[PDB]
């Protein structure tokens, strides 16, 4: 036979099986960091799959064994896209930084297979469409709760068709017209409570929503929101029609969300609701997550008295 057998020296039927490497996989996982340290290097969170116990990667589609075509670039493409938060990080050595075609993705070089996957994922202007769906949903929430919010008017600035993927500046998307006056605090982040809405007052409110695409090196969206807010409000090109507002930061690759700005009464709970439900409900994000999944070819195998299980050594609380 024209091939080389590296086990020329033994036979499994006759000699038994003289090694077992099943602890190697376990201890490899414990040394890389655990499944958590391992999947923070991946596109796992941008799939929004609830947890990784269901993951399943595609258990010949057809007899062209002969034809020139050759390697089908699909297994390599899937390995490359899956790992893309690490293969495409930010803190690198040499590499000429370039914005992707119609999106807000930065590459630091040329990884053509990765660029092809990422392009095919955000086709048909999906980046701006996501911006539109998010901002529409927020306007609608305000459209409804005008009553409690003291909001006379809500103004959706007909969008500059490239505000979504311009990363160095800001128009503003939401402008809120009060009834009488809002007394407004100093700026703080969407997850902190202590807010004394006393400093100034206005009828004009602006709200910003900005999309990024994080990577392993930098996916903290809190400091993104803080830094972007300070910069964008204290710059001299951003057309903000009021010195009062907030920016909403969305991380598409890790599906995170936060915000930073000057608040007024009712805003904190209001947008907290709006964010925690738009992240879940919006159909744009759904088309995203679905193209991500179909590019990975990931599937979930998951489908869908207790007190015999309840008094166990497992603690379970009754609220």
């Amino acid at each position: 036979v024209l091939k080389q057998n590296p086990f020329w020296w033994t036979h499994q039927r006759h000699d038994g099986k003289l090694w077992n490497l099943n602890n190697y996989r376990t201890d490899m996982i414990q040394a890389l960091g655990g499944v958590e340290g391992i999947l923070e290097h991946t596109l796992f969170k941008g799939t929004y799959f609830p947890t990784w116990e269901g993951l399943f990667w595609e258990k010949w589609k057809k007899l062209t064994n002969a034809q020139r075509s050759g390697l089908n670039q699909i297994p390599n493409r899937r390995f490359t896209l899956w790992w893309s938060p690490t293969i495409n990080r930010a803190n690198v050595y040499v590499g000429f930084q370039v914005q992707l075609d119609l999106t807000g993705i930065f590459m630091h070089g040329k990884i053509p297979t990765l660029k092809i996957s990422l392009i095919q994922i955000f086709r048909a202007h999906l980046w701006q469409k996501i911006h539109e769906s998010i901002v529409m949903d927020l306007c609608q929430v305000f459209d409804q709760e005008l009553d409690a919010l003291e909001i006379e008017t809500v103004q959706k600035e007909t969008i500059h068709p490239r505000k979504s993927y311009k990363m160095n500046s800001s128009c503003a998307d939401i402008l809120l017209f009060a009834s009488y006056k809002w007394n407004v605090s100093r700026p703080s982040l969407l997850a902190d409570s202590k807010d004394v809405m006393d400093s100034t007052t206005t009828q004009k409110y602006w709200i910003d929503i900005q999309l990024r695409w994080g990577d392993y090196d930098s996916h903290d969206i809190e400091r993104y929101a803080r830094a972007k807010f300070l910069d964008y409000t204290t710059d001299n090109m951003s057309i903000y029609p009021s010195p009062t507002g907030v920016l909403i930061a969305i991380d598409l690759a890790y599906n995170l969300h936060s915000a930073y700005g000057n608040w007024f009464p009712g805003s904190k709970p209001l947008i907290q609701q709006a964010m925690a439900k738009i992240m879940k409900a919006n159909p744009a994000l759904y088309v995203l997550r679905e193209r991500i999944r179909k590019g990975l070819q990931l599937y979930s195998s998951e489908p869908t008295q207790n007190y015999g299980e309840l008094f166990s050594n497992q603690i379970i609380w009754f609220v």
Partner: protein
């Protein structure tokens, strides 16, 4: 032919009996002869035991043969040469099989051959480098270890490793003279932090223990 042969005498001047069998390079040294200093140390050493007196009477030191290192290296060379029409996972399965077939055959001659350890470092890093070259970059930070060693279930490639061990070093002059010891630790392949990547050698069980194990297991089953 005398040039392809090898004859080795043991007398009152040579205490060592060296030979070279199926793939191993062995050297027997009895305790009677010039071992005033004796140790029991790293498993490269079999302890032969006189079966009637049941006392350990000599030690066999093992190494991998030179043509077996060369055969492993040429095998990796043709993994790499015929891999431009294959996927990352096929290249890594061929590497996995080659390396398992070497490590499970030799198994403690590999500990004692300081030339293998370097061979294995360079060969594993050549496989990794060809996978990087497969993408269009070799930057050391686009490809931390986690990308290669993550199992095939979490989407990694699934490499098996023996290149993250430290290579012991000691003072070339006497090292070509008198088996001096180990004072320094050169570094193996480079991991993104401490990171302590596990090792194939620690999960395969040495021969000298498998043979005792087998003796007792079959004796008691009989």
């Amino acid at each position: 032919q005398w040039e392809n042969s090898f004859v080795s005498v043991y007398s009152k001047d040579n205490p060592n009996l060296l030979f070279n069998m199926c793939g191993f390079e062995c050297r027997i040294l009895p305790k009677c002869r010039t071992s005033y200093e004796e140790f029991t140390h790293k498993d490269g050493v079999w302890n032969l035991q006189n079966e009637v007196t049941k006392e350990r009477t000599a030690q066999c030191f093992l190494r991998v043969d030179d043509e077996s290192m060369q055969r492993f290296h040429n095998r990796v060379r043709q993994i790499l040469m015929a891999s431009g029409s294959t996927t990352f996972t096929k290249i890594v399965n061929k590497w996995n099989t080659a390396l398992i077939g070497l490590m499970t055959y030799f198994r403690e001659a590999v500990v004692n051959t300081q030339e293998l350890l370097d061979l294995l470092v360079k060969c594993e890093n050549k496989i990794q480098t060809r996978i990087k070259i497969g993408l269009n970059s070799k930057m050391p930070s686009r490809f931390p270890p986690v990308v290669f060693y993550t199992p095939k279930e979490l989407g990694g490639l699934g490499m098996l490793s023996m290149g993250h061990v430290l290579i012991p070093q000691s003072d070339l002059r006497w090292s070509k003279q008198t088996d001096v010891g180990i004072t320094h630790f050169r570094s193996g392949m480079s991991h993104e932090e401490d990171q302590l990547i596990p090792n194939l050698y620690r999960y395969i069980q040495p021969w000298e223990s498998e043979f005792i194990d087998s003796q007792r297991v079959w004796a008691e089953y009989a």
